[PDB]
Amino acid sequence: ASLNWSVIVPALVIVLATVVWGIGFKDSFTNFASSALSAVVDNLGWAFILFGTVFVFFIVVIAASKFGTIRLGRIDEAPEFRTVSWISMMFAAGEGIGLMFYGTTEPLTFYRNGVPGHDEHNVGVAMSTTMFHWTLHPWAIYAIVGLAIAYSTFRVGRKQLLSSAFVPLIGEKGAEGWLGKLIDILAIIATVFGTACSLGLGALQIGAGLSAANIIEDPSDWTIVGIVSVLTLAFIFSAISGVGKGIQYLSNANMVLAALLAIFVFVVGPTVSILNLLPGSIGNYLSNFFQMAGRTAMSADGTAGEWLGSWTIFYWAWWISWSPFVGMFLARISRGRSIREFILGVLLVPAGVSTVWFSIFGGTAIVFEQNGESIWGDGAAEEQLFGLLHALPGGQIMGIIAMILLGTFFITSADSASTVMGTMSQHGQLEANKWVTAAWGVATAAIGLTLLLSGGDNALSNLQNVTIVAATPFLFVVIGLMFALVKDLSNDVIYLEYRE
Amino acid sequence: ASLNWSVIVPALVIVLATVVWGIGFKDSFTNFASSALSAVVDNLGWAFILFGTVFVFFIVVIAASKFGTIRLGRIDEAPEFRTVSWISMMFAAGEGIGLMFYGTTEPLTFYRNGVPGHDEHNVGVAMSTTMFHWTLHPWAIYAIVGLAIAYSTFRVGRKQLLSSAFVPLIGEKGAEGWLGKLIDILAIIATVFGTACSLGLGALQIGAGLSAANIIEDPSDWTIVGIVSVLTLAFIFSAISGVGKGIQYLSNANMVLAALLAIFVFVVGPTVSILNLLPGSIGNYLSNFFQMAGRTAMSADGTAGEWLGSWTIFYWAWWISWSPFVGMFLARISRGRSIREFILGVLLVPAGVSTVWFSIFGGTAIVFEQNGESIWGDGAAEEQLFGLLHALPGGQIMGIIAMILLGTFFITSADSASTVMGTMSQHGQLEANKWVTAAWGVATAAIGLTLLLSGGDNALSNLQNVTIVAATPFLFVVIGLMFALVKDLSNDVIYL
Amino acid sequence: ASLNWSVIVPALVIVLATVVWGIGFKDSFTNFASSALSAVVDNLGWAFILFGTVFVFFIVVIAASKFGTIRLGRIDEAPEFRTVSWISMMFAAGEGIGLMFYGTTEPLTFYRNGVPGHDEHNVGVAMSTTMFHWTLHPWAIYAIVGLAIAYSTFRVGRKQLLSSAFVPLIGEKGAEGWLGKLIDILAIIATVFGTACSLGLGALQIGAGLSAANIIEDPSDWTIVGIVSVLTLAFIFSAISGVGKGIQYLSNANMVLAALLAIFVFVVGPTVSILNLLPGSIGNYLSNFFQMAGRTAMSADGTAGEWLGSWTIFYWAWWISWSPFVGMFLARISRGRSIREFILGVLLVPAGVSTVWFSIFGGTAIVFEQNGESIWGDGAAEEQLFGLLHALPGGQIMGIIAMILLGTFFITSADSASTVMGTMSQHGQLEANKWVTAAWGVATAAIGLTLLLSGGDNALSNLQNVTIVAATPFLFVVIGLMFALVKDLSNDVIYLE
Ligand SMILES: CCCCCCCCCCCCCCCCCC(=O)O[C@@H](COC(=O)CCCCCCCCCCCCCCC)COP(=O)(O)OC[C@H](O)CO
Ligand SMILES: CCCCCCCCCCCCCCCCCC(=O)O[C@@H](COC(=O)CCCCCCCCCCCCCCC)COP(=O)(O)OC[C@H](O)CO
Ligand SMILES: CCCCCCCCCCCCCCCCCC(=O)O[C@@H](COC(=O)CCCCCCCCCCCCCCC)COP(=O)(O)OC[C@H](O)CO
Ligand SMILES: CCCCCCCCCCCCO[C@@H]1O[C@H](CO)[C@@H](O[C@H]2O[C@H](CO)[C@@H](O)[C@H](O)[C@H]2O)[C@H](O)[C@H]1O
């Protein structure tokens, strides 16, 4: 039960500096994030865009190559979980607060405003651009990290860490040396800022959903939502035990409430129009896939840079930062799975759920816009969902259910991430200290709250700007994780049985 | 060997008492078809569009998988036909009447009017859209149904029926039970209306051809009756005379006459422009494939719904209703082949023939539009081919040949389909009774004539409306045929 | 190996006839080239466009098939060049002069004027259209011709000749008869005119560079003669002297000066914008690949014919002319490599260089257009690189390096191609006589000069018209080489490789 204090102190110190900086110096912190956002988006936006699509190609090649047959674990090892059970668990890997936050807003803004290189009121571009940010690019990054940890821990028996995946390139001297520790420090920092963004989005949307109950104010979002969801629920469940019996119950509530919320909009909404957006979004996603993969700051005659920072480069930075958690989560539930089957399940099942989600919620909002009724309202992204729900019969009750669903994603997402952060701080130990897991949840919630407070009126922008800067160092870890992964697969397994 | 009357009577009652009484109540029939068409297109257009493209993906994955090495028959068994006879045998089946009917109009109307999401006068979109409805989506449906029948009756030795292909899902108890009969009844009803649509188009075009040749005035309802009555009688005489040499004489004449017509327009039309369209049709088809596959009733800002019901959803329903006949036809001529070579041949050979055919007739009509000439006339879809032909030297002679070519496709299509329905009503008997074969052909021509007579001015609209309604029940059989086929393929003798 | 006078003469008099016709009768030569260009583009433009993309599919389908594992050489053979070295030699047999000439002009032209079916000021279309003409279509032709030559020479032990690759179709007797001689004659003629075009572009740009550097008042007709005479003489000295140290030293300078030029523009130019165009050009290339593959004279409502004849049908003809040389060059350095390794290396490595090259020079030129500057100037295609350089600090000294780089490309392009021509006029001898190698290089320079002199104010247009006519016969040799390569490879799987 040793603690990697050399990995805790660096990653921890950076968090407190961000929390201290964003509270007493909101102006200075806001300026730096805006300034740093500009430097990263200009000088490295190509790197996010270029390597975003390299990940999709790289993981498809790996699945279709000889490496697909490799089995994550002992040869002829039965998977620990059934296929249907394994499929049902990836839903806990999904981004339930981002899907709820951007379920209506994203396809609606693309429809209302258009995207660079396209005109307004284009349904296919609206749905295809949303599927770009949510289906394959996010889950190619998670597959790469999940595959690297799965192979290292199961097929090679190495420590469950991000640095253990780099043993092929830097060996054990680097993995336990300065470079290995740096890779593990950047993984914790990325997870804190990747998770903090979702917690901040959820707190923002719950605050908008409470408009029916109370008027919104800074303290309502600041203390009430933040402290209540982080304290009464996250700490208590974690402190009581590693498996508090609440996270398993709440993980069920996330599945049940999400399905009921989708079914209510699907049934009570424009059912036929939603079913039209199923093949419409998949077809237009595949048609425009490379047209959006090649959209850079020089697209639209050079005017695409501002849009990309808000939408595409933010999502790429967000996915890159969530990779250490989602990679660890997918690795755990995929022992004994083949590489080809692991990639196919991870790539396609989450893509199918995101497609259906945005068709129901994105399609319903677009249908309203077409008919004249606009749920746009003022335009804030945190109240588009509750505008959509209030526009259907029974919306008041389901609007309350959406608030409860967000609350259970806040606790579930914090507990799932804090568990991985504890593993990285205990030399890859599967069962981590209750206090260590609690502390990482507090820090992540403190970061997500500080981003909201510092931003003020532009709370969402400060949330997005900080995530891009925090995910930049780990973009190069994922790139080097592709080279390490090929060396690992090519070195051990091939020579094991057939070649030698 | 005996007749399955539990399948004939349910199918005959729907064909006889329900539809063929569209001559007694035309106003009532048209309203139902219009109302039923709106219900299907609105509430189930997504299903046709979504699963039309899944068939293409599913069939490509089957060939690319380890299943492609399975032989359709006994292991290490050679194909019965040569790869040249086999490939030329695919030139039977086929639309034939649909290619002549829509050979000129479909690419021309898309050029004149455009398509949802695109502006008019786009040659790439006009030709890519035509290739969408005729090359891969139709022949992925046929390959699935043909592959399921070929696998069940050749490798596994089951009966040659649609229901026998569902034994993996429903078991032998189901295949002989209520569900097995329902699948066979739906297969017959789909084939009757899928073929009745082709016969209706063939009779409409022959009526337009006769007026264009000045033999008759504008064709009336009685003239259409004579065409269908005369052609069906010629079909009966061949069938009831026994095993006749006439049908193969007509099947060969279809190849020569169809090729003679395509060569004439190619050599006499804008050869260079037609040739330019061969890369243009194929390149733009692959460019827009998924853009067209993602076109739904709420594309073009909720404006593609009317267009889809007339053009895309009609074809998908038309192909799904054709699948039982073309599936059985492909199974017979593909014994001993591998799944990979069967799929690739079925997918690509018709894709190349359709691409070349529409380039000669779609391209020639579009070239006239650009130059200043125009074969649109009054906009009727049945008179465009003869407008194209009469616009070229020697057009009068070749216009007659087009009518002759349509007449032979009528008998060839009625007989080829009536043979499959006879097999479905005789527990999979290949050598079906000649009397049952003639009965199914008469009903098909009676249904086609009813759709034309009922529609009146909007004769085409009534053909397309009823076809979409008839094919909707069989859309879910083909969806289930994918699950049945995969289970069957997985549980092969080589591996369980 | 005795000289093949039955092949030299038919290919020589056609070369000699072009020189006399194009020098003493400039007016008649240009009229025939324009008339013949229209006939070829109108009646066979479909064939160039159809089969340009069939080559890409064919070569990809061969690498991914069971043939991908076949080794180019005796079984269990190892390549004599490391993968790093083998990749380095790929840069030789690249255009060099073509990249230098069209590095700035092509992407800038499409951005400013647009392409059929698209509007102006489209960076994605401008960059993808340039990638269409330089990345996969050219190198799918070179991989087909190089693979066919490599397989028949190493795996089968035939002669290092193009007609030897048709033995599966026309038998051993056929390769020695008229049909085999015809393929050899066409292969030489195609190489001479494909090489003359690159040399003609090189002398056209050098004359522009001299004027841009104020060394000379203007590039008169005699100025172009002086450039070609000086550079062709230097090529002769290297071949006659027998000292290969000179050429290998020049070949290294090409990589050093080319990389130096590219890095200078990358660093002093808009670096961030250049980096944006890397994913932007690759992504928009894969998006539009089939839209551009389907572009014919019937596109844009029947208005793309003139554009295609100038841009796409010229490049397809130009690559078909370069095929015999790049085919032999690739085969020589690709011994012991599997089919899959050869196809992947040949397709992807040169595609990577071209994407970077046009992003640096095309992207810099486009960025100047956006900001209000414009290196377009008079619109002359041979002065756009030097307009781009003089717009950057230190571009006057770097303008000289661009000219010296053009000259070294001129010397090595002539020597590299004439070596292949000498080989294929001496029964496939690996090292033919230096005198015969020098004779073919001089003949190549004479046509390049003749096309430039005959064209006059339309020198560039004359080069393209003649290149399209010369490559038309060879378009069918490459088409049939696909049917001969599959037949030859299949006989190996019977051998089981
Ligand atoms: C939740 C909403 C719906 C989601 C829908 C997605 C469903 C995905 C579920 C995937 C399950 C896990 C993946 C299982 C793959 C198995 C890998 C494997 O082992 O190879 C097999 C599978 O290989 C394949 O052929 C892959 C299937 C084709 C995949 C093509 C998918 C195309 C879809 C892309 C659409 C575009 C995506 C858009 C995203 C928005 C080969 O089978 P075999 O019979 O040889 O196996 C051996 C046998 O048992 C003897 O021992
Ligand atoms: C054919 C027009 C229909 C277009 C509509 C359908 C869209 C698909 C078009 C592209 C499909 C290519 C099919 C052939 C290649 C894949 C099949 C394979 O893997 O094995 C091939 C193995 O063959 C090879 O080794 C070479 C591969 C051929 C690669 C494709 C050829 C070109 C296809 C289209 C070119 C597009 C040109 C216009 C540009 C837009 C067998 O094909 P084949 O050689 O029998 O087909 C051609 C026949 O021989 C003609 O004589
Ligand atoms: C910035 C500096 C300026 C200059 C730029 C330099 C550009 C260099 C770019 C380098 C490109 C990499 C290509 C190198 C390939 C050499 C090795 C090779 O031939 O491929 C290997 C193999 O590599 C692979 O496996 C590649 C498989 C994936 C194919 C690549 C897919 C992406 C291609 C995208 C290109 C799209 C077109 C864009 C063109 C503009 C060989 O091994 P093998 O074929 O025996 O392996 C067998 C294996 O089972 C299957 O091949
Ligand atoms: C009007 C234009 C004409 C149409 C356009 C041209 C399209 C040509 C399509 C022909 C494709 C035929 O399909 C081709 O069949 C052969 C055998 O017959 C298959 O053959 C291959 O796979 C099968 C099974 O794995 C094996 O039996 C065989 O040994 C192997 O070579 C190919 O996998 C397939 O590519």
mmCIF file of N, CA and C in Angstrom, chain C residues 439-470:
data_model
loop_
_atom_site.group_PDB
_atom_site.id
_atom_site.type_symbol
_atom_site.label_atom_id
_atom_site.label_comp_id
_atom_site.label_asym_id
_atom_site.label_seq_id
_atom_site.Cartn_x
_atom_site.Cartn_y
_atom_site.Cartn_z
ATOM 1 N N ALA C 439 24.503 10.200 -75.704
ATOM 2 C CA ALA C 439 23.728 10.522 -76.897
ATOM 3 C C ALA C 439 22.255 10.719 -76.568
ATOM 4 N N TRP C 440 21.706 9.888 -75.682
ATOM 5 C CA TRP C 440 20.295 10.016 -75.331
ATOM 6 C C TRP C 440 20.032 11.260 -74.494
ATOM 7 N N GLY C 441 20.975 11.646 -73.637
ATOM 8 C CA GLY C 441 20.803 12.867 -72.870
ATOM 9 C C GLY C 441 20.831 14.111 -73.737
ATOM 10 N N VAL C 442 21.688 14.121 -74.758
ATOM 11 C CA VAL C 442 21.727 15.252 -75.681
ATOM 12 C C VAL C 442 20.435 15.331 -76.482
ATOM 13 N N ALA C 443 19.918 14.184 -76.925
ATOM 14 C CA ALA C 443 18.661 14.175 -77.663
ATOM 15 C C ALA C 443 17.514 14.682 -76.802
ATOM 16 N N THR C 444 17.508 14.323 -75.517
ATOM 17 C CA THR C 444 16.479 14.822 -74.611
ATOM 18 C C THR C 444 16.550 16.338 -74.482
ATOM 19 N N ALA C 445 17.763 16.888 -74.399
ATOM 20 C CA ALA C 445 17.918 18.331 -74.260
ATOM 21 C C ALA C 445 17.498 19.059 -75.529
ATOM 22 N N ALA C 446 17.718 18.445 -76.690
ATOM 23 C CA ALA C 446 17.362 19.097 -77.945
ATOM 24 C C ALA C 446 15.855 19.287 -78.057
ATOM 25 N N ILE C 447 15.074 18.288 -77.645
ATOM 26 C CA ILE C 447 13.620 18.430 -77.674
ATOM 27 C C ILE C 447 13.163 19.483 -76.674
ATOM 28 N N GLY C 448 13.691 19.437 -75.453
ATOM 29 C CA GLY C 448 13.318 20.440 -74.470
ATOM 30 C C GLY C 448 13.593 21.848 -74.955
ATOM 31 N N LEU C 449 14.736 22.049 -75.611
ATOM 32 C CA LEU C 449 15.017 23.339 -76.229
ATOM 33 C C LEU C 449 14.083 23.604 -77.405
ATOM 34 N N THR C 450 13.837 22.588 -78.237
ATOM 35 C CA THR C 450 13.004 22.786 -79.419
ATOM 36 C C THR C 450 11.582 23.175 -79.038
ATOM 37 N N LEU C 451 11.013 22.512 -78.031
ATOM 38 C CA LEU C 451 9.663 22.858 -77.601
ATOM 39 C C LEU C 451 9.610 24.284 -77.078
ATOM 40 N N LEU C 452 10.621 24.688 -76.308
ATOM 41 C CA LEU C 452 10.653 26.043 -75.771
ATOM 42 C C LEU C 452 10.812 27.076 -76.879
ATOM 43 N N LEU C 453 11.706 26.816 -77.833
ATOM 44 C CA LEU C 453 11.930 27.768 -78.915
ATOM 45 C C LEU C 453 10.713 27.867 -79.825
ATOM 46 N N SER C 454 10.105 26.729 -80.157
ATOM 47 C CA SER C 454 8.952 26.735 -81.049
ATOM 48 C C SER C 454 7.766 27.453 -80.421
ATOM 49 N N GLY C 455 7.533 27.237 -79.127
ATOM 50 C CA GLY C 455 6.364 27.819 -78.488
ATOM 51 C C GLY C 455 6.414 29.333 -78.426
ATOM 52 N N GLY C 456 7.600 29.894 -78.209
ATOM 53 C CA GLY C 456 7.736 31.330 -78.069
ATOM 54 C C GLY C 456 7.063 31.853 -76.818
ATOM 55 N N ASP C 457 6.144 32.807 -76.978
ATOM 56 C CA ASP C 457 5.431 33.350 -75.828
ATOM 57 C C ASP C 457 4.547 32.309 -75.154
ATOM 58 N N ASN C 458 4.288 31.187 -75.818
ATOM 59 C CA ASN C 458 3.507 30.084 -75.275
ATOM 60 C C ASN C 458 4.380 28.847 -75.113
ATOM 61 N N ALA C 459 5.595 29.038 -74.594
ATOM 62 C CA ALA C 459 6.525 27.922 -74.464
ATOM 63 C C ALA C 459 5.979 26.852 -73.532
ATOM 64 N N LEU C 460 5.379 27.261 -72.414
ATOM 65 C CA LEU C 460 4.821 26.288 -71.482
ATOM 66 C C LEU C 460 3.679 25.506 -72.118
ATOM 67 N N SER C 461 2.822 26.183 -72.882
ATOM 68 C CA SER C 461 1.711 25.493 -73.527
ATOM 69 C C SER C 461 2.207 24.484 -74.552
ATOM 70 N N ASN C 462 3.276 24.816 -75.280
ATOM 71 C CA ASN C 462 3.813 23.884 -76.266
ATOM 72 C C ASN C 462 4.360 22.627 -75.602
ATOM 73 N N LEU C 463 5.020 22.779 -74.452
ATOM 74 C CA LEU C 463 5.536 21.617 -73.739
ATOM 75 C C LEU C 463 4.416 20.667 -73.344
ATOM 76 N N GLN C 464 3.300 21.207 -72.859
ATOM 77 C CA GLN C 464 2.206 20.355 -72.406
ATOM 78 C C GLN C 464 1.519 19.662 -73.575
ATOM 79 N N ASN C 465 1.321 20.373 -74.685
ATOM 80 C CA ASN C 465 0.655 19.771 -75.835
ATOM 81 C C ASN C 465 1.459 18.605 -76.395
ATOM 82 N N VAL C 466 2.780 18.760 -76.493
ATOM 83 C CA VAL C 466 3.618 17.701 -77.045
ATOM 84 C C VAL C 466 3.728 16.536 -76.070
ATOM 85 N N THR C 467 3.763 16.825 -74.769
ATOM 86 C CA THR C 467 3.850 15.758 -73.777
ATOM 87 C C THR C 467 2.604 14.881 -73.797
ATOM 88 N N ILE C 468 1.431 15.483 -73.999
ATOM 89 C CA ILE C 468 0.198 14.703 -74.023
ATOM 90 C C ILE C 468 0.162 13.795 -75.244
ATOM 91 N N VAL C 469 0.648 14.283 -76.385
ATOM 92 C CA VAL C 469 0.618 13.485 -77.605
ATOM 93 C C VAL C 469 1.601 12.326 -77.513
ATOM 94 N N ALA C 470 2.774 12.562 -76.924
ATOM 95 C CA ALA C 470 3.796 11.522 -76.854
ATOM 96 C C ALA C 470 3.409 10.400 -75.900
#
